[PDB]
Design a protein around this ligand. Structure first.
Ligand SMILES: [Cl-]
Ligand SMILES: [Cl-]
Ligand SMILES: [Zn+2]
Length: 265
């Protein structure tokens, strides 16, 4: 055999979507239980209860690299927190089909009086050769389609921007992944083309989005002409604004304040 099919985390119960390689003795329990803070997984309600009363953690275990109102993001090294990032990944694998030491993990949380509650995360290669600025990305099911996923995406590109590099998520993307990325890409590019005469290489330099990713989005928006083996921006500001009212490309409800990001390349 039996797999893990149900987990309990904070106050949510979540069915699994995919096989996750927990040990055999864990998959056989009817349900599984975790710290919403330290992410220890457990086999029984009774040992969950003891842990709830003993665990001192009230937030993820890295550096709080971003903060604005009750939204915070945590930078967690793969070498420095092997077990945590190991449990994060097995949590991730229940909802993704896609060693933790080569990676850094960025934990999205909304905070209250009790602590910083995990909502979603993304990982990324400390140094990526094919320039993947995202390895894995995931909004926990109870939080999906509320802007958290598009926030994670926006955060990964602001990191790239502070890095003087362009990036692209590792493939493949979940169906949600595809949707969230076209939306984020489109909203960003349109707003640029709403104010500013710019080339594709120039759009990529502003946004850290790869040119292939820029091309295919403007392609999808039908805003590029093809001239003798060259892609050329060609957009009416009218059609620009028409696309912005589309629910597919409407501004995301929650947004990354670059001032509130305190990170160092
Ligand atoms: Cl569920
Ligand atoms: Cl989203
Ligand atoms: Zn704990």
């Amino acid at each position: 055999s039996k797999y893990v099919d149900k987990i309990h985390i904070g106050n949510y119960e979540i069915d699994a979507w995919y096989f996750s390689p927990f040990p055999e003795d864990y998959g056989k329990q009817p349900k599984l239980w975790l710290c919403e803070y330290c992410l220890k997984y457990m086999k029984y309600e009774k040992s969950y209860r003891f842990h709830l009363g003993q665990c001192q953690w009230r937030q993820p275990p890295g550096k709080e690299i971003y903060r604005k109102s009750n939204i915070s993001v945590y930078e967690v090294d793969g070498k420095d927190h092997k077990i945590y990032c190991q449990n994060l990944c097995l949590l991730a694998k229940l909802f993704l089909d896609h060693d933790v030491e080569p990676f850094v993990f960025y934990i999205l949380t909304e905070v209250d009086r009790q602590g910083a509650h995990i909502v979603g995360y993304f990982s990324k290669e400390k140094e990526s050769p094919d320039g993947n600025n995202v390895a894995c990305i995931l909004t926990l099911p109870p939080y999906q389609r509320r802007g958290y996923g598009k926030f994670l995406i926006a955060f990964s590109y602001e990191l790239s921007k502070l890095e003087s590099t362009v990036g692209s998520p590792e493939k493949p993307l979940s169906d949600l992944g595809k949707l969230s990325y076209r939306s984020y890409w489109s909203w960003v590019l349109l707003e640029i083309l709403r104010d500013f005469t710019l080339s594709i290489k120039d759009l990529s330099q502003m946004t850290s989005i790869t040119q292939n990713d820029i091309i295919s989005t403007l392609q999808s928006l039908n805003m590029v002409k093809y001239w003798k083996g060259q892609h050329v921006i060609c957009v009416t500001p009218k059609l620009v604004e028409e696309h912005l009212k589309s629910a597919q490309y409407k501004k995301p409800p929650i947004t990354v304040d670059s001032v509130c990001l305190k990170w160092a390349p």
